[PDB]
């Protein structure tokens, strides 16, 4: 929040305006999923795939 | 618990009901229930009480 | 909820209140008393003056 | 006449028991 | 090297602010408990004037 | 040494912050609810005597 | 709804008598009118009711109890 | 005839118990 002051010779602030409390927010949102997908046949795993890690 | 009454039943008598625990009345007055034609349907008892 | 005290003078008690107005930013004080008189019998008093 | 509901009495009993229960070899037994 | 006392004082002030900032709710609860247990009118504090 | 000698009732260290507890903290809610129950009972009892 | 209520309140001017079917239609229209304008006040808390210790209140925020009305104090008119 | 409502009796018993409860190694146990 932010405010403002007043200047009076004696402190009488009866007839002037007072600071109001206007509140604001910052809104964040989620994005889109990040997906990496692979596939391979069962025979390939047994005969033609090594060092999968 | 609070009693439930009708406006036409209790109107004009609220000053006696508002102070039944401070003063010590001999009785409490209340009217009857009437139809649109003026016939009497129910007694002077309150309709019910809240739970 | 007002700051108060009492004071004494010649056997009489006086109540003092101290308060303030915030917006005008002023401070004020008051002292209060309440008397009461009775007259029992008028035939037991009066005014006297010297005879000529 | 005025009446007392069961919920108020149950709350009275429960709180009165719970305050005492919460508020408290031989030395280890003491609070 | 903080030759002047006006240079030594604000370091103390920042140190006090740093020490005061985290330990504020523990002492909060301690003061609340003491006031609740000992003040003769403290068990209803927070709503003393209500109606 | 610093001549301050601290005394604690019960002390723990949970999340980088020292925490302490005495003997009155744990029973505040039942007491402040019992008081309200008693007050509400008294008001209702006094409302309608007979 | 408005038309049927007006017909009910104005039919006596020409010295006729409404029929039960018209009465039922008027009642149904009035019920449809009243359905759309409900209130359901949904009563609040009391005001001295304690709020839980699990809500984690603070000193300068007060709210040890649900908010309620607060007295007016004046030092010039001795109401007391 | 007259009757005694439940709330008054409940308050009577409750306050009678609370007075005695509030108003009070053997030496340490004394008030």
TrEMBL record, chain C:
It comes from the Viruses. This is Gene 5 protein.
From TrEMBL, chain F:
The chain holds residues 305 to 354 of 708 of the full protein. The gene is 3. This is Gene 3 protein. It comes from the Viruses.
TrEMBL record, chain G:
Coiled coil: none annotated. The keyword Metal-binding applies. The keyword Metal-binding applies. One of its GO terms (molecular function) is metal ion binding. GO terms for biological process: symbiont genome ejection through host cell envelope, short tail mechanism. Keywords: Calcium, Metal-binding. This is Gene 7 protein. It comes from Shigella phage Sf6 (Shigella flexneri bacteriophage VI). The gene is 7. The chain holds residues 81 to 160 of 160 of the full protein.
């Amino acid at each position: 929040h932010q405010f403002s002051s007043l200047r009076t010779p004696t402190g009488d602030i009866s007839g002037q305006n007072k600071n109001n409390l206007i509140s604001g927010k910052a809104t964040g949102r989620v994005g889109n999923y990040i997906t990496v997908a692979v596939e391979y046949q069962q025979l390939e795993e047994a005969i033609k795939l090594n060092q999968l890690e | 618990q609070i009693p439930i009454v009708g406006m036409e039943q209790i109107r004009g008598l609220e000053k006696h009901w508002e102070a039944r625990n401070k003063k010590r009345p001999a009785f409490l007055p209340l009217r009857e229930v009437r139809d649109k034609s003026g016939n009497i349907i129910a007694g002077a008892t309150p309709a019910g009480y809240t739970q | 909820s007002i700051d108060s005290a009492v004071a004494t003078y010649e056997g009489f008690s006086i109540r003092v209140h101290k308060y303030a107005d915030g917006d005008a930013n002023v401070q004020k004080m008051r002292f209060d008393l309440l008397p009461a008189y009775v007259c029992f019998n008028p035939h037991m008093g009066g005014q006297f003056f010297g005879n000529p | 006449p005025a009446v007392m509901n069961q919920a108020l009495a149950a709350l009275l009993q429960q709180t009165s028991a719970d305050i005492q229960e919460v508020t408290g070899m031989n030395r280890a037994d003491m609070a | 090297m903080a030759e002047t006392l006006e240079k030594k004082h604000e370091r103390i002030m920042l140190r006090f602010d740093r020490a005061y900032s985290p330990q504020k709710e523990v002492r909060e609860k301690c003061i609340e408990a003491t006031r609740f247990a000992r003040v003769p009118g403290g068990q209803w504090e927070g709503a003393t004037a209500a109606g | 040494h610093i001549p301050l000698i601290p005394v604690y009732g019960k002390r723990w260290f949970i999340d980088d912050i020292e925490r302490v507890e005495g003997h009155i903290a744990k029973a505040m809610d039942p007491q402040r609810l019992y008081n309200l129950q008693v007050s509400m009972l008294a008001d209702t009892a006094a409302q309608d005597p007979g | 709804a408005v038309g049927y209520q007006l017909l009910l309140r104005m039919l006596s001017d020409y010295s006729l008598e409404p029929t039960p079917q018209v009465l039922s239609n008027a009642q149904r229209s009035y019920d449809a009118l009243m359905t759309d304008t409900l209130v359901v006040p949904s009563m609040r808390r009391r005001g001295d009711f304690p709020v839980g210790q699990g809500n984690k209140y603070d000193v300068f925020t007060s709210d040890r109890y649900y908010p309620g009305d607060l007295p007016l104090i004046d030092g010039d008119i001795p109401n007391a």
